[PDB]
Amino acid sequence: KNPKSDKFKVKRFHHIEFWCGDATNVARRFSWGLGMRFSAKSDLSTGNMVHASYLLTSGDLRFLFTAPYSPSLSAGEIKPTTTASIPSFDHGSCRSFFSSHGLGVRAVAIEVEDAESAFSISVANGAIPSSPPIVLNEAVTIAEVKLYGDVVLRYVSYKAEFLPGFERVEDASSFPLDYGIRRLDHAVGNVPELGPALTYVAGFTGFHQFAEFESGLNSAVLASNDEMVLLPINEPVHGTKRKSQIQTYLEHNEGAGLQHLALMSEDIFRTLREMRKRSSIGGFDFMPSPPPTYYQNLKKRVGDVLSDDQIKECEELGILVDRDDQGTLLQIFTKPLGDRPTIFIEIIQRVGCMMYQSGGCGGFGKGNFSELFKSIEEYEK
């Protein structure tokens, strides 16, 4: 059931912004680890005395990494005279965010036809304003509302080069890395109580519940009209035998915030080969391997979609596989991206539901919870 209730028109994810203490080191780690090119900068070299911001891109995926400079470099400025390229930026907000959460996502930015209307409609429907709409170089409008915790939903609209004031990175300082990652598929929040969080976000966006088909979670997925923009939210299930991963998140994150980013690959086998190659030389580690019992039940589940060679390839790379009403989902999770057991990344590829591919094809892997529990018992046999 898709009522198509978006209160303003939404296109697609535009970028994800990380708030960090050093944007250079995080951006270079992520670039090597995920195979993303350095494509735009805004910093001292471009006349930005406020923040350093570096953009990495892979296909349509845009990761922005931003950290503050000493406030003393911009003490003479006022908001109208600012040299920040992201006018919503605030030294104290950024410093307070990082000291509270460590490295994490500050803004989930979606592109809209009209960011000012998006902001107005949103707030008129209960969104908590975070930063009012501001027109950038007569070309781009940016506005922010609170999403959950200290994460904001950033609206971006273009009248017609990432953002004004950013410069393209020099050819020599930009290496054409690519491991097959192509776009952001969904962005997931962890909150203490799912009900109020869903009601708030569904309330100001018009996004509808997407619906799926023990685990330490309960969750729901909000989606835009074409279900391209997918924003799931998790809450803990207390009292379970194993402590809820969501509860561990909330404790180490100091409250609600973004849990994982799921990135679509055009070739999850190539992506995981390239990323695993680099795990111990600066890249990302992956979740522990599932038992062989899991991969010895994979043919009886998905053998109609993937060859026995590809199923062996899944056991080598640790890929998990689940099946929807409509399609198949290949998926794997990284270990946390930084010091804290908080944010992590999911790599995915979905097979099926072609019209282009419809969003959410295959679901989010809900069945892998019970399939992994069984193989755990079956292996100890």
Ligand X SMILES: Cn1c(=O)n(CC(F)(F)F)c(=O)c2cc([N+](=O)[O-])c(C(=O)C3=C(O)CCCC3=O)cc21
Q: Name the DSSP letter for residue 179.
A: S
The amino acid at 363: G
**Degrees, nearest 5: CA angle 289-290-294:** 150
- Residues between 330 and 349 with contacts to Co ion, criterion CB under 5 A: 346
Q: Is 118 in contact with 112 (CB distance < 8 Å)?
A: yes
Three-class secondary structure assignment of 326-361: CEEEEEEEECCCCCCCCCEEEEEEEEECECCECCCC
Distances (CA, A) of 20 to 14, 28, 51, 54: 20, 13, 11, 11
Residue nearest to ligand X (CB): 365
58-75 burial, b at 16+ Cβ within 10 Å, e below that, comes to bbebbbbbbbbeeeeebe
Question: Out of ligand X, a copy of itself, Co ion, none, which partner does residue 368 contact, by CB within 5 to 8 A per kind?
Answer: ligand X
Site string for ligand X, 281-320 (x = CB under 6 A): ------x--------------------------------x
Q: Please tell me whether residue 254 binds a copy of itself under the rule CB under 8 A.
A: yes
Cβ proximity to a copy of itself, 27 vs 145, nearer residue = 27
Q: Name the DSSP letter for residue 286.
A: B
- Site size toward ligand X, by CB under 6 A: 19
Site string for ligand X, 90-109 (x = CB under 6 A): --------------------
Contacting range for Co ion; rule: CB under 5 A; set: 6-14, 91-99, 261-269, 367-375: 261-269
Q: Please tell me whether residue 268 binds ligand X under the rule CB under 6 A.
A: no
- Alpha-carbon distance of 227 to 359, in angstroms, equals 5
Please name the residue that has the structure tokens 């030294």: 91
Least distance in Å: CB of 153 to ligand X?
Answer: 17
Least distance in Å: CB of 204 to ligand X?
Answer: 21
Q: At what angle do helices 115-124 and 194-205 cross, to 10 degrees?
A: 130
Site string for a copy of itself, 35-54 (x = CB under 8 A): ---x----xx-------x--
Task: List contacts with a copy of itself (CB under 8 A).
Answer: 20-26, 28-33, 38, 43-44, 52, 67, 69-70, 72-73, 95, 98-100, 102-103, 172-175, 177, 251-254, 279-283, 285, 337-341
Task: List contacts with ligand X (CB under 6 A).
Answer: 186, 188, 217, 219, 221, 232, 234, 245, 259-260, 287, 320, 333, 346, 364-365, 368-369, 372
